[PDB]
């Protein structure tokens, strides 16, 4: 997570600064050819996050998903990890779809640039780090956790099935925006998009009560 | 970002009104008041300023958006909002 | 029109992005297996 997650930020930061400090994912598109290295950097990072075999995230996440599955755990707890992993790929597609795979949407005057060696060297430095990453660490550290061996193949593929499954519909849902049909506001979208409703309530109700208690009561 | 200077603004400005098919290119003047001579309905005036908004990337407040009325005046309000003096 | 014209047109498809570099990646593959198969054969 130190390698590929750190990547996605200045990879995103590259598009932000180059495309005039704009952070709304609805203004990019077509950046694949505009910033080939930044686009190349992001796809490796996203694939690492999803847990593509033999590169970074596979050496940990694919082992973890297999590990928690291969244990006496809470059944409800195990289920959410699978849904999260599928959802982990889901937003990864959303970034690659809206930001890169599309058509330009930024202001007319284009200033896209990544030729600065500082940006190129910094990104490339972690790129070679993220490509191999887990191979070196797993092969180098002594074998100091117990490795489970006999997986019934149906659940050993779950580490890849759920993300590949999540890749499918998320792509289908994303390019459904390209479909001319209007998008009616679904109440679930009104819930998920608003940070899951947590900031609207917990940052307004408890703060108001304690503050009102301090002045109205307490002090006065 | 190179200094965006008022000559570039009006070049980009009249680029968009000429683009607007309701205002065909021939009679664009720098101070061509929209509905007075071009006949552009004020309901579309609250529409050409968002075209300006994405053109230069910033929000025009409504208090003056209804007042943003002429292409030269379009440029004029653009310059001071981004301290464009050159 | 500019967003749909010029070099900005004909953008690559979604799956087209992920397999970027496959043609060269497979090119590096075939020589790699050839090198190791010969090396294994010499052993």
């Amino acid at each position: 997570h130190a390698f590929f997650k750190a990547m996605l930020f200045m990879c995103s930061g590259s598009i932000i600064h180059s495309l005039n400090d704009e952070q709304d994912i609805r203004k990019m598109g077509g950046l694949y050819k505009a910033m080939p290295f930044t686009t190349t950097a992001l796809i490796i990072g996203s694939l690492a996050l999803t847990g593509m075999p033999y590169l970074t995230g596979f050496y940990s996440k694919d082992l973890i998903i297999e590990a928690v599955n291969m244990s006496y755990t809470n059944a409800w707890a195990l289920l959410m990890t699978l849904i999260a992993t599928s959802l982990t790929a889901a937003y990864s597609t959303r970034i690659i779809f809206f930001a890169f795979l599309g058509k330009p949407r930024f202001p007319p005057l284009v200033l896209i640039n990544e030729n600065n060696p500082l940006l190129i060297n910094s990104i490339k430095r972690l790129l070679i780090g993220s490509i191999f990453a887990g191979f070196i660490i797993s092969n180098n550290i002594p074998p100091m956790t117990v490795p489970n061996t006999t997986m019934p193949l149906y659940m050993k593929m779950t580490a890849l099935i759920v993300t590949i499954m999540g890749f499918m519909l998320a792509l289908e849902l994303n390019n459904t925006t390209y479909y001319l049909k209007f998008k009616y506001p679904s109440q679930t979208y009104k819930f998920s998009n608003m940070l899951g409703y947590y900031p609207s309530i917990m940052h307004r109700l408890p703060t108001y009560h304690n503050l009102s208690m301090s002045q109205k009561s307490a002090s006065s | 970002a190179p200094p965006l200077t008022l000559e570039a603004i009006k070049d980009r400005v009249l680029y968009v009104l000429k683009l607007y098919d309701k205002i065909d290119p021939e009679k664009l003047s720098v101070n061509s008041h929209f509905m007075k001579d071009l006949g552009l309905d004020s309901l579309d005036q609250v529409e050409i300023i968002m075209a300006m908004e994405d053109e230069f990337g910033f929000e025009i407040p409504d208090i003056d958006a209804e007042k943003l009325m002429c292409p030269q005046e379009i440029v004029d309000y653009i310059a001071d909002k981004k301290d464009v003096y050159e | 029109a500019w967003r749909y014209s010029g070099g900005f047109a004909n953008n690559v498809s979604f799956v087209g992005a992920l397999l970027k570099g496959f043609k060269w990646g497979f090119a590096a593959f075939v020589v790699a297996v050839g090198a190791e198969y010969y090396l294994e054969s010499q052993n």
Binding site: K33, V110, I112, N115 | R12 | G6
Partner: peptide, 20 residues
């Protein structure tokens, strides 16, 4: 932003790239 940048911007066009 002085004159002489190798990524000279464009208006409504595909930005120039470099082989590197």
């Amino acid at each position: 932003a002085g004159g002489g940048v190798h990524i000279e911007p464009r208006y409504r066009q595909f930005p120039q790239l470099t082989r590197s």
